[PDB]
Amino acid sequence: PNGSTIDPDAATTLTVHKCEQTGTGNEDPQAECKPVSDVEFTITKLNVDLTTYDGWKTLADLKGDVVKAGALKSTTVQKITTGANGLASFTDAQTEVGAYLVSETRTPDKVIPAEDFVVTLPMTNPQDTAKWNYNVHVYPKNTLSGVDKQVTDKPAPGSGRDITYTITTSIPKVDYPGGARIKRYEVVDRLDKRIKKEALTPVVKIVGQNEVTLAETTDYTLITAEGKDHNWATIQLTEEGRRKASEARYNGNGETKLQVTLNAKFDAAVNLEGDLSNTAGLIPNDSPNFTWDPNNPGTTTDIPGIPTTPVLSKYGKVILTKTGTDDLADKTKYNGAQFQVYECTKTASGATLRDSDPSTQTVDPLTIGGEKTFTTAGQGTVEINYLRANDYVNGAKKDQLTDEDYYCLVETKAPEGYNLQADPLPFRVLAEKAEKKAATEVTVTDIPK
Ligand SMILES: [Ca+2]
Ligand SMILES: [Ca+2]
Ligand SMILES: [Ca+2]
Ligand SMILES: [Ca+2]
């Protein structure tokens, strides 16, 4: 057959590449693609004859409207489910010369669906416009740009202080002016049981170009529940909240998102040693595979819906040992020394203490586990429980550290027979110790009188 015109009896294939993150028709060997298995694609042949100019003209007239293409659907349908390599490889047995509507028709809960799209077999090869390409490769786009969770714990160096979580989730684009509405939209947070689930004081916004704040009851309701190994908080948009979201996204773009702020609170003496992990998930539609019931998590442990990566806060124990240049074997002589703790900047002359509460003129020490003063006892020791790692803050490792990234002990009362210190004493709590619940061991040496 002639190479320049369409061969009605040509063998064809259609290969859909399903990737976690996201069109020439040619295979693109990298092409960064983390393949996604177990996703079903359905192709439906359209009622256009691509062996005729009129068939191509019908497609052109759609001006890329995929919903209008749906009006051309035949009853000729084929399906394939991706394997480990994320490919849905429709064969020559499954495809013929013509146009197809391609839709992702089964999607594991955690996976973002592809957008529907139309493909032709063959395509004119843009890399060689003298060729008809009968073996088409397509890399579909995600319908949602992402879901993300952040933590702000820079304000919480001492354990038990407030931590803020911010969850930001894509909103599906639906045909708002046509009457289409998101039918279900829930943001679920899997809460560590150390957080007070009854005191989250949520704030919900639609962010992007021009942000708005949504109203509880009117636009959403917060539903919390006890769980097995965690507790649970769901922000569930109401009919009006869903309407606002549907509209905002339609008039906006992919970066028009819901933003949920949760204000996590603790008992002051909370045992935060180690990692405090938080994860959220998005349920973006009313598909029956999302069986989450915000009021009945039952024994669920995995986050429902499309998950964020977890975010961590890391708090460590400090064990302070008090001694002296006299090195007495009777360690009880080093009891009764008192200390307070600050964030500080190490300097050539010691350290500059940072005021823990800038609202007042007095330079205040940190409140750590509800306490400000730590007194040696026993064998001249005291535990300071617990301090957030200096090198892990706001949900990320601080790759580079500076002299600003310190805590300081200040000796506020010397043990009997000893001097106070000349300077504050800088130290760090490192994530490598805190995340393993390993103590940070600091020795303070006193000068005898
Ligand atoms: Ca065929
Ligand atoms: Ca499910
Ligand atoms: Ca000094
Ligand atoms: Ca102050």
Residue numbers in the entry: 35 to 56, 64 to 490
Please quote the paper that reports this structure.
A construct comprising residues 31–491 of FimP (FimP31–491) from A. oris strain T14V was expressed in E. coli, purified and crystallized. The refined model comprises residues 35–490. The M-domain is stabilized by a bond between Lys-190 and Asn-319, linking two strands that run anti-parallel to each other. The C-domain also contains one isopeptide bond, formed between Lys-363 and Asp-487. There is no isopeptide bond observed in the N-domain but when superimposing the C-domain with the N-domain it is obvious that the N-domain also has all the necessary amino acids, Lys-52, Asn-183 and Glu-145, to form an isopeptide linkage. The fourth metal seems to have a structural role and is coordinated by a long loop in the C-domain, protruding from the S6 sheet.
Type-1 pili mediate the first attachment to host salivary proline-rich proteins (PRPs) that coat the tooth, whereas type-2 pili mediate attachment to carbohydrate structures on oral streptococci and host cells. FimP is an elongated protein, approximately 105 Å long and 35 Å wide, folded into three IgG-like domains: the N-terminal (N), middle (M) and C-terminal (C) domains. In FimP, the lysine of the pilin motif (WNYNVHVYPK) is exposed on the hinge that connects the N- and M-domains, and is thereby available for the sortase mediated pili polymerization reaction.
